Design a protein around this ligand. Structure first.
Ligand SMILES: Cc1cc2nc3c(=O)[nH]c(=O)nc-3n(C[C@H](O)[C@H](O)[C@H](O)COP(=O)(O)OP(=O)(O)OC[C@H]3O[C@@H](n4cnc5c(N)ncnc54)[C@H](O)[C@@H]3O)c2cc1C
Ligand SMILES: *N(O)c1cc(C(F)(F)F)cc2c(=O)nc(N3CCC4(CC3)OC[C@H](C)O4)sc12
Length: 427
């Protein structure tokens, strides 16, 4: 039933060999776990979704990895309660297409639709609407968790078992296997966005745009920013903000199916600077999911710095541009309020995603970035991380001990284990 497979995260780095189970039969998954629990210690088990996490949180070298993608039954969708009851292996793309005809919108979407509900919960994923909607965990009304004792537990965010529910959110698989969840969806009357585009010339302008109160007018906000140019250019951005459109805001051609699923010589001169300002500046543009949300040998790096530490954030950015490591795909956003999950990554503050080409000295440079992020009160994201230390991680998440204590109640014999758990000492 299990196949010895060579696994890696999305970054295609740090491989380890695991016996991978792949079954639609929930019963065989249950017996598998009990089989891991019976054989004493061993290197335990971990669930895996679509493998989109860049790090080592869904591989388990020398142990068992359970592939959850064949558990992809959508059980029910209800437009009146706005609830969706789905297996953990359903992906958000499948969920998005199933839910649209009910006037229901997946409440948190990440940069790719190929992620499982299970993965979305376990990494407590965020998106472009974090400042208005929180993260994925905020919208989960219930989940069924297969715990180390072989029993399936029904968890809810309030009432008893709350502690365990909030340990599972952003718990990277380490409380057990989410089999099934109920999600509350966002009502919508269209599959479209209405978007305002703003272009800044400086980091200080980017920050001001995000501090002037304009952010409250928009449910979705993000920006591509310059991580390469010298200041004051550094941190100039193409900002894209907006909301889901209502049917009366759609052009006529689109009002009958409102919920339809869907370099040159001038380039571095002043004429292109002008083109770039023009084409990035607009009001009330209607856009489908792709145009607005997916507008598009590397090391993905993501951090958030708390809101108040704006000087510190600016400094980190400068260290990056003077580093001699050049990143082109840079996404910036201001996160809103955090949730109660002790290992949830997002906090209110300045979030950035960069992508460095693997080069001589990068490894030791990002270690130095880790220290700055730590010192400035931020954290890195397990979904993006393959290489930080246990000591850095623990200090970045001061509620880790509180989280560890919950995991020890639910998994006393350390039945659930991963490459990340051992590296980050969450085992
Ligand atoms: C191109 C790209 C863009 C991205 N953009 C964003 C973004 O904008 N925002 C964001 O937050 N993230 C983003 N991500 C990261 C991605 O959203 C998360 O890594 C997500 O957790 C991946 O889902 P997955 O199903 O592939 O899970 P995997 O990568 O297979 O697993 C991730 C973690 O979830 C756990 N897990 C999976 N299934 C279960 C289950 N059934 N029960 C318990 N635990 C489980 C795993 O054990 C592992 O710890 C991006 C990734 C890529 C490749
Ligand atoms: N950081 O990676 C990041 C943060 C956010 C936000 F929610 F915090 F704002 C959003 C976000 C995103 O929407 N997309 C990202 N992509 C990274 C990789 C990608 C697709 C989208 O970019 C080009 C390449 C083809 O794939 S990251 C991101």
């Amino acid at each position: 039933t299990t196949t010895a497979t060579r696994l890696t995260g999305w970054g295609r780095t740090a491989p380890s060999v695991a016996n991978v189970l792949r079954t639609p039969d929930a019963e065989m998954i249950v017996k598998a776990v009990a089989r891991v629990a019976e054989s004493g210690g061993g290197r335990g088990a971990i669930a895996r979704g679509l493998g989109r996490s860049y790090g080592d949180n869904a591989q388990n070298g020398g142990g068992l990895v359970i592939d959850m993608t064949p558990l992809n039954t959508i059980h029910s969708i209800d437009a009146d309660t706005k609830l969706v009851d789905i297996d953990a292996g359903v992906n958000l793309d499948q969920l998005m297409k199933a839910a649209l005809p009910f006037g229901l919108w997946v409440p948190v979407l990440p940069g790719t639709r190929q992620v499982t509900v299970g993965g979305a919960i376990a990494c407590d994923i965020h998106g472009k609407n974090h400042h208005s909607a929180g993260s994925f965990g905020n919208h989960v009304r219930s989940m069924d968790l297969l715990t180390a004792d072989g029993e399936i537990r029904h968890l809810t965010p309030t009432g008893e078992d709350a502690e365990l529910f909030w340990a599972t959110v952003g718990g990277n698989g380490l409380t057990g296997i989410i089999m099934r969840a109920t999600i509350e969806m966002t009502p919508t009357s269209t599959a479209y966005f209405i978007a305002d585009g703003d272009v800044t010339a400086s980091l200080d302008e980017t920050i001001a745009l995000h501090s002037d109160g304009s952010e409250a007018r928009y449910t979705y906000s993000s920006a591509w920013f310059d991580a390469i140019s010298a200041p004051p250019k550094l941190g100039r951005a193409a900002v894209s903000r907006g909301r889901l459109a209502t049917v009366e805001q759609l052009p006529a051609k689109l009002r009958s199916e409102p919920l339809k699923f869907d370099a040159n010589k001038y380039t571095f001169g002043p004429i292109g600077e002008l083109w770039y300002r023009k084409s990035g500046t607009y009001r009330g543009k209607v856009q489908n999911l792709t145009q607005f949300y997916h507008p598009l040998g590397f090391l993905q790096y993501q951090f958030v710095i708390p809101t108040e530490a704006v000087d510190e954030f600016k400094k980190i950015i400068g260290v990056i541009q003077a580093s001699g490591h050049y990143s082109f795909l840079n996404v910036f956003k201001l996160f809103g309020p955090r949730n109660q999950a002790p290992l949830s990554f997002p906090i209110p503050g300045w979030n950035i995603c960069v992508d460095f080409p693997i080069k001589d000295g990068l490894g030791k440079f990002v270690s130095e970035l880790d220290r700055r992020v730590l010192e400035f009160g931020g954290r890195l994201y397990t979904a993006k991380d393959s290489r930080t230390t246990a000591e850095t991680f623990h200090a970045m998440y001061p509620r880790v001990d509180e989280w560890i204590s919950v995991r020890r109640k639910v998994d006393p014999l350390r039945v659930f284990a991963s490459d990340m758990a051992r590296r980050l000492e969450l085992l």
